[model samples]
Target: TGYLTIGGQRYQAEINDLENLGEMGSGTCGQVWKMRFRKTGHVIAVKQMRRSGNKEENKRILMDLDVVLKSHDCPYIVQCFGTFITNTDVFIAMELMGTCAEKLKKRMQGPIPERILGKMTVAIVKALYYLKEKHGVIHRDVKPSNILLDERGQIKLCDFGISGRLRADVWSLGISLVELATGQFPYKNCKTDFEVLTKVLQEEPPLLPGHMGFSGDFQSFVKDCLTKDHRKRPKYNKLLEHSFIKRYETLEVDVASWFKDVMAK
Candidate 1:
């Protein structure tokens, strides 16, 4: 093994120094494993993407690699320790987060409480804002799967496999919020991709269920993100000032306890 690069400097350990602790999960492009670096005794979620020795695979590898590298600028972004590249694989050693927001949603029996939702909303807004202001980049795919929750009550965004503009991410965030809040994707009833797109573009945007006791402020917040007209959609700067976001700062939240409760179920 050569070397794992961390923060633009040469690092002591490489892929060779890691020992697998367990398989955390897998996705379309890679397998995520909990591994420990023997040299530093640091455990990380290593996303291993194996290549077929072709151009397309390696191209995306570098694409994703570039994302985790720069994403750490904000506290709400997942912390990636380093990366290792081999002839046929790319390894990304990231912070060992407990579960992604999407996974937590599936395991839950009901909608998330508004307090927890507000906490998560704050983290995502800060993350997207930092990404735009600091990197001039957007998280193209800002869904539940891309947002991770840790044991420390931290809600962070991850997975930059897709690349694009900022306004569209607002829509994705809105969709993600609806699903987590009401226990349903607005288009969950749609049978196919075509139908989902049709509903998204040709229909009114989704809202937090009015019958669920959600506050007017929370409902309005989701509305801003899901505006049919992209021009009216709020970006990170404007979103940071929203009532839902500002409301979180005044209340003391205990997301860590909520996380444990969800996981135990």
Candidate 2:
């Protein structure tokens, strides 16, 4: 119903301009759709967050807008072009992702290759660093499903409804890597959510098998991430220099081709 400006230019994105391709996914607070801009024939992902709610819920939606806008400049975070508001909802026009790590793993039916996983891990860590170092925010929920990739092999973090300190994200990223390495959830056998919670609290952190053809540095990286004592966890800058991540620091990984092959299957 209105316009947003970027680089001093006005963009009045109307609902009519968006041709909804189909549902991408849904959540308790919002739904996402694969859409295209009719005028430019450009594809995008629109997250329709419900705004008709209590004051606090509406405030949260606005906060989401602020966070997305602030993060638009980062390469490792999901890019939101602009946001528009309607009587009942707020639509966030953003980058379209081909798939997330979770869905890709399901299709692959096994662990992702360590090299690919290493690259993916580096991407997530960089994003976390950007959020913490630049925005003074934390991604409380960091999981495979929240980490998405495009056909071009561009990986970015998504779903930032909950923000906290950096260590929480570090822990979550550890769990995500374990899932990527094992091709299964860390506690897949937990009968209930309560049991899962208990296991995380009482048991030792999940470990990646050395027999999985993983490097010692990679295994150590995962262990460092799962450190029960958050204070002992490495900050993003330290992780940026870790051997596991250093290997890919200057290496140009063909992640896009890897994704293409995974999708072709």
Candidate 3:
């Protein structure tokens, strides 16, 4: 019945226009639903954050809306269609993605090939670079689950509930790369956040298993991303120029085909 402004973008969608397809998933903030626009049959993902007593929780929800709307111009970042505010929750409609990298990795029977991983890496790196250079935003979370791909071969970064400095994102991306190279969770052995933090500080960053095979350049690239000292971590532009990245930056990667094949498994 009315319009809402998100990062200066206007949306005029009514709550009744959304047809609930089903529950897509849940996160720390709230549950997500697959929804359809009844009039156009357009599909979208709606994330609903429940009202909470904690001030910080409320602030993070607003920040997520801000970051997604502000970075909408970037092709590599997930786009927000609009937002709805109700008395009980805040609802956000975003681009519908087929699946996430983490789910794809879990479905695969083996480690992702370097070629495939390289394509994903380049997309994510470009997104991070754009967020940092243009929007002055940092995606605090850079794990596989937050990196999404659709049937059109479109890959983009999602979930910015807690944006931080750029170096933290590099560290998180390094963790994701290790998972892609090994087909295992980066911190599977650690059960709790505290335990994960301990391991992160006490042990060397996760590496691609030598037995599995990867280029020295790829290994070095991971090393640079996961540098224990945030100060020493490579910047996004520098990483864009890395040998491993440069090798595949211009290659024609058929991500849609690869994504379809993975889903077929």
Candidate 4:
């Protein structure tokens, strides 16, 4: 079969891609590499899954690929182009991201422009809300690494290996957003699962500095999502109306215009 290239970009066979760079801090699954398309000169990140894990873990990983495959059409989500499978490994190909959400936070300084963050956050919130409300999928692992950004600085949710088809992803997403805003994990030294449960189980985890901008309404929305009592959380439609989104008005003004306004005063 011939290779498929869309919009002036062609992907090399996973085996043929020259491993240009190795990603750091990636766990045991495998290493991520930067690859250049021989024909188009575009660089992309290739995430190659290692064969070290047993059959069950492999199955879960495949499930993640399946979710990507199912949701490929979404503009705000990561685009999964194809996958290559061999007896020794599985290579799932997707659009390479310029930076993860964690790094983007630093690039923007103390706080990213509320308008920009609001727009990006809206996209992510809708994506997560869609998966859970429409498809009943749960992205069990929702963190900065799983969220990618493109050169245009748009947000994308990626890495669904730990996701499930049930409702657990909502809470995972809530915590992920919390981490995204704060750049720190919650309760790093808790000795027991019960401690972790006690912390998040409350209707609303205590508000932290990162969440300071959120109004009472938005805070309530997050409370619903992060509640220890899962049943108490609002439905996806209600979640979209959270006060966090009200902090900015991207559509009302161009990013450059807003910055100029800040400088004017």
TM-score (C-alpha) between model 3 and the true structure: 0.87
lDDT of the structure predicted as candidate 1: 0.81
lDDT of 1 by residue, 113-224 (tens): 8899899999988887887887777778888888899878999887666664346788888888899998887888899999999988888788887888999999999999
**1-265, model 3: which lDDT tens digit per residue?**
1344445667677778889999877745457799987998988888877776456666666787788888868888887877777887678887789988888888896687887788888889999899889878887888988889887888888877788644678988888989888888778888799999999999988877787679887888888988999778888989999998998788888888888988998
lDDT of 4 by residue, 219-261 (tens): 5545666766657766667666666655542355353443334
Per-residue alpha-carbon lDDT of candidate 2 for residues 46-85, written as tens digits (9 for 90 to 100): 8776755556555555565567778877888877777777
Which is the leading candidate under TM-score?
2
What TM-score against the true fold does each predicted structure earn?
Answer: 0.89, 0.90, 0.87, 0.75
Candidate 1 TM-score versus the reference: 0.89
As a whole number from 0 to 100, the lDDT of residue 243 in candidate 4 is 66
Task: Give the better candidate number (1 or 4) by TM-score.
Answer: 1
Evaluate residue 202 in candidate 3 and report its C-alpha lDDT on the 0 to 100 scale. 96
lDDT per model vs. reference: 0.81, 0.82, 0.82, 0.61
